[PDB]
Design an enzyme around this catalytic site. Structure first.
Site, PDB file in Angstrom:
ATOM      1  NE  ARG A 159       4.592  -2.484   4.796  1.00  0.00           N
ATOM      2  CZ  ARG A 159       3.578  -3.251   5.171  1.00  0.00           C
ATOM      3  NH1 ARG A 159       3.761  -4.309   5.947  1.00  0.00           N
ATOM      4  NH2 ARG A 159       2.348  -2.951   4.753  1.00  0.00           N
TER       5      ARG A 159
ATOM      6  CG  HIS B  93       1.835   4.244   5.111  1.00  0.00           C
ATOM      7  ND1 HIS B  93       3.138   3.874   4.860  1.00  0.00           N
ATOM      8  CD2 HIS B  93       1.079   3.650   4.156  1.00  0.00           C
ATOM      9  CE1 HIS B  93       3.168   3.080   3.806  1.00  0.00           C
ATOM     10  NE2 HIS B  93       1.933   2.934   3.355  1.00  0.00           N
TER      11      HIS B  93
ATOM     12  CD  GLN C 278       0.471   4.980  -0.332  1.00  0.00           C
ATOM     13  OE1 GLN C 278       0.927   3.827  -0.351  1.00  0.00           O
ATOM     14  NE2 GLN C 278       0.119   5.633  -1.436  1.00  0.00           N
TER      15      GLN C 278
ATOM     16  CG  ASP D 119      -6.314   1.079   2.531  1.00  0.00           C
ATOM     17  OD1 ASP D 119      -6.129   0.240   1.625  1.00  0.00           O
ATOM     18  OD2 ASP D 119      -5.573   1.138   3.558  1.00  0.00           O
TER      19      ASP D 119
ATOM     20  CB  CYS E 118      -2.510   3.293  -0.223  1.00  0.00           C
ATOM     21  SG  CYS E 118      -3.695   2.430   0.823  1.00  0.00           S
TER      22      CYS E 118
ATOM     23  NE  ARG F  58       4.660   4.284  -1.097  1.00  0.00           N
ATOM     24  CZ  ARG F  58       4.558   3.128  -0.457  1.00  0.00           C
ATOM     25  NH1 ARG F  58       3.644   2.235  -0.785  1.00  0.00           N
ATOM     26  NH2 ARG F  58       5.395   2.859   0.534  1.00  0.00           N
TER      27      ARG F  58
END
Ligand SMILES: [Br-]
Lengths: 333, 332, 328
Positions: B105, B132, B135, B230, B272, B318
């Site tokens: 990450r 990503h 997610q 987001d 998210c 997740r």
């Protein structure tokens, strides 16, 4: 072969036959894992890892070794105040000792680790101090044994090139003192270790079947080498001006193909405790090539680092198997 | 046939493989809820490379590992990022000699690509600047659970706000594989790269879907089964950059009026996380005072706390999808 | 004992005296089981999150080792960036973690934080220290007192806290007396006393259990008859607090005034007793604190000092809390 409940503060606390037993256990543990028959001797046991300074390689080695053997770990990374500033080491050791079965300390002076050992009531292992780095030496000695099988260390010739005054240089004098390697320190005289330490390690190594040679002459120094070993010339803890003069002083001592050919040994292997500045496409590497003409690498070139002579990744893996041996041998019977 | 493969972006897989992965996540979620989880990763050691912090991703990887019997080493942000002083290749090969799988990450997709080329063990992208995927795995499973009778190519998903980023790119990927009817509702300077848009739109159409980019909120959200958003701002960027992003995006705030514009009483809300919906946090108070952002920023507290909001089902998911990735790639 | 299943552990006053006694007996069981190699792991398959908004090596190790002995796994979430509530709301944190973890320890800032995490997590939340309460430490201390003074009930014991009590340690002392009947004395300057309404609430509860709470600047009257003496670190600004508190130092003279040669010394740690430390050399040199600060090294290392039993017992009592609140 009783390391049980002993400490592991520095390789000098042990005799050649003990270091040999510790290396044979690591080879068994290594083989055991490769063959999927690993027996865990540390199930139930909890280990604390004190790191007053960062080292990923050393942390992962301790963590994976513990996990494979069934132990659990608490990683205590840098927190600012070094032990002994606000709180006595005496107090830290006696609290952790009540709670953990073993304590790794990586950080500053050997005096710190030695005090932690006196009071913890449990085995303490030195993952690195200013003075000694026994887990790295163990791992180098195991790598050397694996790639030159059937020869005692005093049947072998080790070159360490570059800056021999830094902490890895002293470890080489320590290695030869105890094993009797034919050790050659190929470095400019400005970077030679303290002569007193040199006189004293040579006698110890001579008595063990080896020698210690200090020379600026690369072509003579490396004749017959079984292994060439180097480390970085500079530190991120010094400024650009210091780098310029270290590089000018030491660039002639770079481990490159021509150095390896100067050995006359087609099976010479190359070693580096890591991290290594060999790749000129990293951010720092691109600056060093542009600023200093260091294309293709610094203390070692990419050609050598990536060649079949290079065992640096066997050597890194062996950090873990040797540290596992230390923990199995000091914590189980 | 995920065994020993990497998880770098969604379009490295086919729709049926992603479908296989989602059904595995569902099974491992149910097995844990019913107390009959089978540890497949015992004896495995996993390394978590975090060049940037994210507690949601760290905990999802830690708990999934631990549930499956593995052990983890969390390598948090530490000094100089990988490839500055030490080669990516070298970090890869040293970790691969010691660990059975590696989560990355942080920064560029080229970093996680290199790690995967040289590690010799599976490498999973926990987030790059460009993609990503874990997610979006969670969001798809969340969407399926909340509309269990519908296929993905029967669903309409609105992503509102700024899509010129890893989230916009991953929405496109997901639409490409599932046939979602995807609307990016955003100002035109906030759309993802045209090339990637073109590629994923053609794929979405074949899976039975569509991708529409528009600044028109009312037309954009008509029919939405889900609205997704987001945060508009990244912490650490200049104050002028906050003020220009707020001026540009605040009209795209997900609020009750926007939900009403869908015409869908069943519409659900995804995010998210973390989200800026609470004007009483310390930052909430500064943004309310400085920019008038009372009630929240990219989404209002009312929407966030409403029955429409499934953000915490989405957060739990997740963990379950990340578990399927690790289980699928580390064991046969 | 399953009465504890799925409960929080936010402060002692949330429990009855019988419940506190239940948690101590479990702690003693678990400690004796470990000593004998017969610990039964109740927490296999469980994952625990440790939110540390402030560093505490002793609290963290206690929680980790307790987890590991019982077969759980832990995620240490230490200090990094902004604290809970600055950028993300407490509630949001609690609801995410509560979906993945079987319990959450919190250590750091105000008691409203740990209480909001407990409201919304949906899983047990344990207070490892807030500005207002420190209940896991007091459990460890209560067990240490019972071990070293075995044949006595708590309401037949006299405990002295000396130093600054206008903080989470004095507050939790008040709690422990209220729950056990201790004869509790807080021996501190007047500017270092805890809030009055807590004193009032606790003083009555303590009286109903057969004890008392007393607040005095008078050391001889305060420490008379003590079975135990407790203190904690006092801390420019440093200078304001030293001059204010140095006369309340725990030294050989203070223990003599108890008239009880079996008096024991307790300290939650870390302690400033060693004047050869970097900080200890500076404090001796600059403030005349030779031989230590809130406790002299003589008391600290004497046979009267049981601080390292107290520290080990952090682990055993944290273990009991987590076993009782996570296993049915
Ligand atoms: Br662990």
């Amino acid at each position: 072969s009783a390391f049980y409940q002993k400490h592991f503060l520095k390789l000098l606390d042990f005799t050649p036959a003990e270091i040999t037993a510790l290396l044979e256990l690591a080879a068994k543990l290594k083989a055991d894992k490769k063959n999927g028959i690993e027996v865990q001797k540390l199930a139930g046991k909890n280990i604390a890892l004190i790191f007053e300074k960062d080292s990923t390689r050393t942390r992962c080695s301790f963590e994976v070794a513990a996990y494979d053997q069934g132990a659990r770990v608490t990683y205590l990374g840098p927190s600012g105040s070094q032990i002994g500033h606000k709180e006595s080491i005496k107090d830290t050791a006696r609290v952790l000792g009540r709670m953990y079965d073993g304590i790794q300390y990586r950080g500053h002076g050997q005096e710190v680790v030695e005090t932690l050992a006196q009071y913890a009531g449990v085995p303490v292992w030195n993952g690195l101090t200013n003075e000694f780095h026994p887990t790295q030496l163990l791992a180098d000695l195991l790598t050397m044994k694996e790639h030159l099988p059937g020869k005692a260390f005093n049947q072998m010739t080790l070159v360490y090139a570059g800056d021999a005054r830094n902490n890895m240089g002293n470890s080489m004098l320590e290695a030869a003192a105890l094993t009797g390697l034919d050790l050659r320190l190929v470095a400019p005289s400005a970077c030679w270790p303290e002569a007193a330490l040199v006189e004293t390690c040579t006698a110890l190594a001579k008595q063990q079947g080896g020698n210690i040679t200090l020379t600026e002459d690369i072509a003579a120094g490396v004749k017959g080498a079984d292994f060439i070993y180097t480390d970085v010339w500079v530190s991120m803890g010094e400024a650009k001006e210091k780098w310029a003069e270290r590089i000018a002083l030491l660039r002639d001592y770079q481990v490159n193909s021509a150095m390896l050919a100067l050995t006359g040994n087609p099976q010479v292997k190359f070693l580096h405790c890591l991290p290594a500045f060999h790749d000129d496409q990293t951010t720092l590497g691109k600056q060093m090539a542009a600023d200093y003409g260091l294309h293709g690498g610094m203390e070692v070139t990419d050609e050598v680092f990536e060649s079949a002579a290079s065992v640096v990744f066997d050597q890194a893996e062996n950090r873990m198997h040797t540290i596992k041996a230390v923990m199995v041998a000091t914590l189980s019977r």
